Structure formats: structure tokens, C-alpha cells
Amino acid sequence: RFLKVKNWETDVVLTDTLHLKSTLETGCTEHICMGSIMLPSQHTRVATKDQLFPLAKEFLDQYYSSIKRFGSKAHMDRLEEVNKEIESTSTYQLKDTELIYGAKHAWRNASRCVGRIQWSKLQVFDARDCTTAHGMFNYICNHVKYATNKGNLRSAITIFPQRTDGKHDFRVWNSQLIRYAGYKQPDGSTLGDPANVQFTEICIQQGWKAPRGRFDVLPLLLQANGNDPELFQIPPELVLEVPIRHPKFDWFKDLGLKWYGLPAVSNMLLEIGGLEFSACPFSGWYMGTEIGVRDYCDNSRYNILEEVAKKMDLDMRKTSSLWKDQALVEINIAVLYSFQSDKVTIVDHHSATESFIKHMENEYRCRGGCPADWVWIVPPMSGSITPVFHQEMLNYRLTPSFEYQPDPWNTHVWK
Template identity: 40%
Template sequence: MTVVDNEPITLDIDAAEGFLRMFHIAHPEAGPVGPRLAEVRDEIAETGTYRHTTAELSYGTRIALRDSGWCTSGVPWRRLKVRDLRGYRNAAAVAGECVEHLRLATNGGEVRPLVTVFAPDTPTAPGPCIWNEQLVRYAGYADGTGDRRYAAFTEAVRGMGWRPPERPGRFDVLPLVVETAHEGPKLFTIPPDVVHEVCLEHPELPWFGSLGLRWHAVPLITNMKLCIGGVTYPAAPFNTWFVGSEVGTRSLADEGGYGAARPVAEALGLDTSAERTLWRDRAVVELNRAVLHSFDLAEVTITDHHAESLHRLSWLRSRQRASTNRPAFRLEASAARRARTGGPARFSNAALETTRPHSPGRLAELLRRRAEG
């Protein structure tokens, strides 16, 4: 049995059957669910897992993104483009298609929501995983230069062989780390020509541009696993578009990120001697204004947090009750740690040594009992 992140790869049969019934209710043209359930039961009994049809994969992926809360306002989830690359297991192929995903999603600034689905976990061949939180993230260095949130990750990839520019800067793009069970973690450079960045300026403050702030155009999330009907796809990168405050407030202003609120406040002549003067709040507002203004000026898709709040409230009102049978994007604690600290690896040497075919005996017995019941 293959063990990843200290957990064996198993299949939730109830989730499989629940999802298939859900799919057939939504797609009556697919015919009755009975024959498909029988087919899947036989496949699980023989192999320990089953393969989604292209239609099932697309439907499950769209529902997962819609229900995740990551689907920003204006995203046409029913027409969401799903790139089915389940045959890709090697690190270089995964990295290359992640870069292609970013190129397609950027779309000259008119950001196009996409999901790319790579090989799933199976009892005999676990799928690849991506360590990075997003495809484009900036390095953080020990002297405080760059994005401080990723200082530990930066040190980890340097230890794995990555070399920053001769003169490290504030916006050095980190390498992509793709890990597979048969190759281990591998580093890949993101080509500069595919990273579309927006230089930030302010609609009313001419000095703002001299701060040298910028940000990348597409939030391509890479470390969340996609779960559909009991099958887990550990690498399923997806993107929508940025909410302005995610850039201005969470990344640039925050002291744990770039700490840009203070220099903005000082340039505004604000009293920064105490938080009670609310200098930070005023500086963050101007940072968020600069982000929205600059993205609009560069004709790059973005939404603001007020529009997004209304969208999220609407989403919460219409949200389905949580169920293990529903498709979902999930972030595991181990994946979150890898994205910030550069470890631990998903596959250990011990796990590789214990890899063996998953016995279908217990699954077959469960399926026989279910059919008889």
C-alpha cells in the first residue's frame, strides 16, 4: 500500500456512489445511473479505484470550484475550461503544463479562469504534487528583502540548488517545486516571459510609483487537492482573478509580507508613532486604490473587495450543505506547511519501499454486500 503524508491511499465508496448519482441527476442525457454504478463497482473491485469519464471530471471540477469559495464574482463556472491531463505524472511534464496554464490564463490581461487536472492518486501510483502555494510567488531573504512570508521556502529551495539573482531583489520569482513518488522533488524555473506583472502607481499621488511596487497578474493556486467522488487529484492547479485587497492588504501592506504600509504612511506625512492614529488603515486604503487603479490601467482583470463581499454573501446563502460526497478543493495541513517552509516531502523513502498493489479483496467484499443489500 502506498503511503503519502503518513496516510494510505484508500477510496471512499460512498463518495463515489454519491457523486455518480449527483452527476446523473444533473445530466439526464447520460442515461440511468445503474449501469454506471455497476461498471464502477466492478472497476473498484478489480483495481481499488476507478476512472472518471471526461464529462464526470469536468462536472466535478466545476462544482468543486463553485462550492470552494475561491470562485470570484463574474467567473462563469458552468463554462469553466478544464484541461484534462490525467496522463501526466512526470515532474517536468507537470511543470511545463503549469507554465502553459499560466500563459493561457493570463490571456493578454483578460484573465481566463482555468483548471488543469493531473494524474490522480491510485493504490499503485500516487499522483504528483506541487509544493508552491501559487505558481508565481516572490522570494524572501534573511535581510528582510522580498516577501517575508516565503523566507523559509526560499531558504529551502536554495538548499535544493536554486540560485537567486546575483543581486537579490524584492520581486524574484521562486522556482516551481514538483514532487513525484518516483523522482522526488524537482525544481523548475518559471520563464520570465510568462509572468505578467503590473507596476503600481496611484491615481492621485505622483510619488507612489517611486516605491517600486508591482504584482503578478494571475493567482494560480497550485497546492490544493481536488477530491471528486472518492478520487483525489493532488495536483489540480486553478485560477480565477485577484481581489484587489488580497494584493494591497494581505501581500503588500502586511508586516509579514512586504511591510509597505509604513513607507506609504511616511510619504503621506502620517503620524506613525502609535497604531491608535490609524495611520496603517489610511495607508492600506491608498495601497488598495493603487492596486485597483494600476490593474485597470494595465487592462488586467481584477475585482474589489466590496463587489466580492456581496458575491460571497450570495454564495453563502445558496451554498449546499457540507457533504463528503460533494466535489471539493481542499488544502491539507502538510501541503500548507510545504508552501511556506519547503517541506516535508510528500513521499518518504520508507513510503516508496512499501509501495505495493492495493488488495481489492476488502473492497470487493464491501461492494458485494452493498449490491446484495
């Protein structure tokens, strides 16, 4: 009940008591580990009024514990006040300071996030007075502009009104605010981003006129208070992009690769005090590997290892030549360089992972632990030359949290 995690590179040992406060479940049992299941049923999100008050009580107690005012008059009165409002309405509303705390601690608790050293530096935009798709668009554009900050990126999140009945739900139908379109061809091959091909079909189903190229920024699909979603185009001056060149290969511009500067996840659920925020897009800055490994070199994403190996003149006959590994390192030297030469914030997988170990140290000290998912923290290349490969990590679910949620087109009662 006082577990220990070791780093088998430095022999550092930390002690985890935080997992005692843990509430939700993991998917594992004593007889089977689910640690490599992508979307476990305990990570996916309808609630009533009986279960609500304990969830509110649990949240309000940790909030007042954090301002060195636990159990005081202001705590007890707010406990009774939310209790009162949950009788009256069978729901309740968070204070501004409560929303900011819950939002930041959802990120803090995100065990698959390697960038959490910044969790306290998060800018919270309260969009809970929004009522239309157009208002959603306005709020999202101000988010994009603010977080982009001319390439000196800044962490932020915009929180739309909380779910209530469940059929009046605010939903961003994009999985990320800025994504490139994906279109299939006659022969079955795919132009653009093969992930978004279904979403691209939906946007044209709603009337998008596609420029049918590679790096075509998708339009937003915004559903407000349960109404059918509407299409909006982020003004291009707000979508910052970095063209990818290499600091050795003058044939790398000829590849003609570029990527948007702002990672901004929009499709997931923010859970605070028992309340569910079905639309809560959040942005930070890219770690190199997310673009140069996953985006560019996944077999079912952009799939460029084929071509980078060609221009490098590599031994592509045999698999054991490691031509794939060799073109993969060049692509990532290139993404990093290209972003860095444009003053656009990016972080390499080595500095990001070192900082996470530093972050883990602080969380075991002033908090008693830090939930972490090794499967997701270790970077997708060069695993064991980074200090997170060698760090034991305890995974557990604390709340406030970010949860996966089903796509709205599989659930939205249409019209």
C-alpha cells in the same frame, strides 16, 4: 431541517435545504464553535477500497441528476461499470465529462471563496496522462499562458494523475505557481516575501541560484509519480506583472511596487467521487484586497504601511490618528488603478462582494442553498460597508471539494 439565513441590511431571507445533502464534518459541536480556526482537521487530507464505492455512487448519482438523466440506463450501466472497475483495480478512472463536472463543483462548493459566481465558467485541463516533472512543467506553462490571456484573465485548472498507493503522488511543491522569493538578512530582517522564506531556502537547497532581490519570481518545484522534485523556471514572457502607481501621488512609482497578475493556487487537494488529486493547480483573477491589504500590509508579509504613511506625511506618533487605515486605503486605490490601467483583470472588494450576494441568491433558488464561511468571505478592510458583512451564512462541507494537504517536504520519503 429547513434553516433560514437573513441579511440585516435589506431584510432579505433565504431558505437553505442544501445543507441536508452535506456529508463531511466542520469541527464544531453543539457545545463549541470552531468557525475561526484556520486549518481545521476536517479541512485536511489515505483511503481504502471498501469506502470507495459509496463515494463513487454518491458522486455518479448527482452527476446524472444534473443532466436530467437520473437513474436511467446510462446511469445504471456506469454505476455497475465503476463498481466492476473498483473490484478489478480497487480504484477507478473518471470520464472526461465527469472530471469537468467534479472539478467545477469543487469550486462551487468552496465555502471560503468569494469569487464563486464564475464557478460554471472554469476551463478544465486534463493532465492525467502526464508521467514526468518535465511534462508537469509543460502542462503548467500552458496553464499560465492560457489563464493569463494577455491580462484578460480566464479561470482554469490543470489536474494531474490521481493518487493511488500514496507514495507515487503528483505534487506541485509551490503554494502558488507565481510567487516572489523571500530571503532573510544578517540582522534578521527579511527581503522579498517573508512567507516563502522557507520555500526559497528549499529551492536553493535544490540548487536555485537566487538573484537575491525583492520581487524575484520563484522557480517551480515539481514532483512526479513520487520522484524527487525538480526545478523549472517559468519563461519570464509568461509571468505577467503590474507595477503599482497611484492616480495622485507621483511618489508612488518611487515606492517601486509590482505584483503578478495571476493568482494560481497549487498546493491543495481536489476530491472527486472518492478519488484524490494531489496536484490540481487552479487560477482566476485577483480581488484588490488580497494584494493591497494582505500581501502588502500584513505585519509578517511585505509590511509597507510604515513607508506609505511616511510619504503621505501622516500623524505617525499616536495610534488613534488612524494613520494605518489612511495609508491602507491609498494602497488599494493604487493596486486597482495600476491593474486597471494595464487591462489586467482585477476586481474591487465591493463589486466582488455584491456579486457574491447575487450568487448566493441564485444558489438558494436553483440549488436550495450555498455554503459560505463569513470569516473568509468578508473582505479584510471596510467590512461593514460591503453587503457580505450583513449576510448570515451557513457553512457546511459538500463534495466534490478542495482540501488542504500537508506540505510534501514533511512527508516525502526522500532519496
